[PDB]
Each structure stands twice: as C-alpha cells, then as structure tokens.
Predict the 3D structure of the following.
Amino acid sequence: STIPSEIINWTILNEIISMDDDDSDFSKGLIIQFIDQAQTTFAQMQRQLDGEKNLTELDNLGHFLKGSSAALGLQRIAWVCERIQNLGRKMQHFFPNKTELVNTLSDKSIINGINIDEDDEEIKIQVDDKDENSIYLILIAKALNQSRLEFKLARIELSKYYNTNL
Amino acid sequence: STIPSEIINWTILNEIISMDDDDSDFSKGLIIQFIDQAQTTFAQMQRQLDGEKNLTELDNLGHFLKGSSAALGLQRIAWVCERIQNLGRKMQHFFPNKTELVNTLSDKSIINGINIDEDDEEIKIQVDDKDENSIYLILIAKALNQSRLEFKLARIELSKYYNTNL
C-alpha cells in the first residue's frame, strides 16, 4: 500500500526517451534487454522456490531486478522486488493479496480484458513447524506471482507507447 | 552547446535514492558499481584507440556507458558518450574543445583547483591521408579525454553528497 499507483514513472522514462533523438533505437533497446533479463530472473527465482530454497539467492536476484526496473521507471516492479528482498532477509513478515495491490492502480482500466491470474505458479511449499523458512518462502512465492503480473502490466503499457508487442 | 549544464540530474537520481528507505545502501551500491564499470569501459576504449582502432567496438562501448550513466542521472557523461557513438558511426564530424564544454557548467567553483587536463591520455593516432577513419579516431580520442574529466567531476559531486570517497 506504499506501492506506487502508476505502472510507469514518466519523469524517469521521458529522460531515457530524450536520448532517442540521437540514437533512434536507444530506449527500445534497453526495454528489450530488460524484458529478457526479467524472464531469466523469474525462472531463476522459481527454481530456488522449487529446489534449494536459498533465501540469500532470492535476496540477490531481487536486488538485481530492483535496480534494473527502477532505472527504467518501472516502479511497481521495483517495489515488489524490494519486498522479495526484505522477505529473503527476514526483515518483513507479510505480503498483501493481489486484490489489494491491483486496487492501488491509478488507471484501473488496464486490467479489463486480462486474466490477472494467468501467469501464477502453484505455491508448492509445504508448511513446516520445524523449518524456520517455510513462511518466508511462501510469502516470496506470492510476491513472485505478483511480480509476474506487474511485469505483464508494464509490457502492455510499454507496447502501447512503442506501438509494437514487446 | 547542447551539453547539460549540471553534472547531476537530481530529479532522476532522487528517484533512485527514494529506495534507500527499505534498503539503506541501495543507491550508493549502484554508484559504486557504475564507477567500476566506467573505469573498465574507459580502459577498453583506450585499448581500441591504441590497438585495432575498431570504430564499431567504440560505438558499442559508448552505447553501454550512455545507458548506465543516463539511468543514474549523470547527464554530462551520457552526452559525451552519445557523441562518441555518433562519431564512431560517422554521423558527426566534430567535437568541441575542453574549454567550451567546461564553460557551460552552471557552477564553475568545482573546477577551481583541478587541472582539467590531469587525466588526459596522449592522442597517438596519426593523421593518415589515406585512412578516412583517422579524423574520427582523433575526435573520439578527444571525446574520451572529456569523458574522463566529466567522470571525475561526477565523482566529486557524488562524494560530497554521500560524504565519503567514491
């Protein structure tokens, strides 16, 4: 609920876009690089959740994507990556439901015509009275599902701007 | 000149620094990461100028550093990188003297005390009559020396902000 309400911070992205005047494919190249890095990072995160379940690896991957997404003005993705980090460090103990987070959008009309659950992965972590990490891993799984939605929403908005499917 | 007159675009960098609230060393870490990459990129550019003199590789190195510097609000570095790129594609055919560029600075108290030629490398490219890449390599050499000054200026401003040696 301190999640930014807009998908794109235009005062950041417009500064990147300024540089397309002397390099026509510049901003679009950075976006295409980001979309590739985010898909690789989400797959790496999912594998941690499904395997070694290393909270420190999940913290590091979250850090990497927070930096990339913030720099391009994709502030809602950056915020969720920040949550994944602080859950991996055990500094936070809660993560909101999709409904709450989707309701914070400044233009709610963007989720009309899409299934906001389409990219969800099943949460496959069994609860444990003994493993002290199960609750954190559950919350990161939820946060990773949110990340995937926010990534989709960003791609829809960026696609409209560039007039092509990104 | 079209070179920005401030070393730091604070409206960009402040957005990045907004995220130190739940991750106290976030922005400082990105800047340390940039300073490391920048020093490596200047070295590789110098190796090209001194070695195989590949204009396309100089274009790629300029592209990379333009992306990293723009994203952190280091707008004078980004501008010079955009020149290097355009010189390497032979779309521009000139680059100004250090004097004209330094005089665009909105605060000239920062160069009080520094030798603006301190970090220059000698231009060791000969004006060959037959090679049409020759003038462009000289201009990129000249631009690399400006980049080195702009980099030092950025490190001074950022060090004063974070209150430590960066």
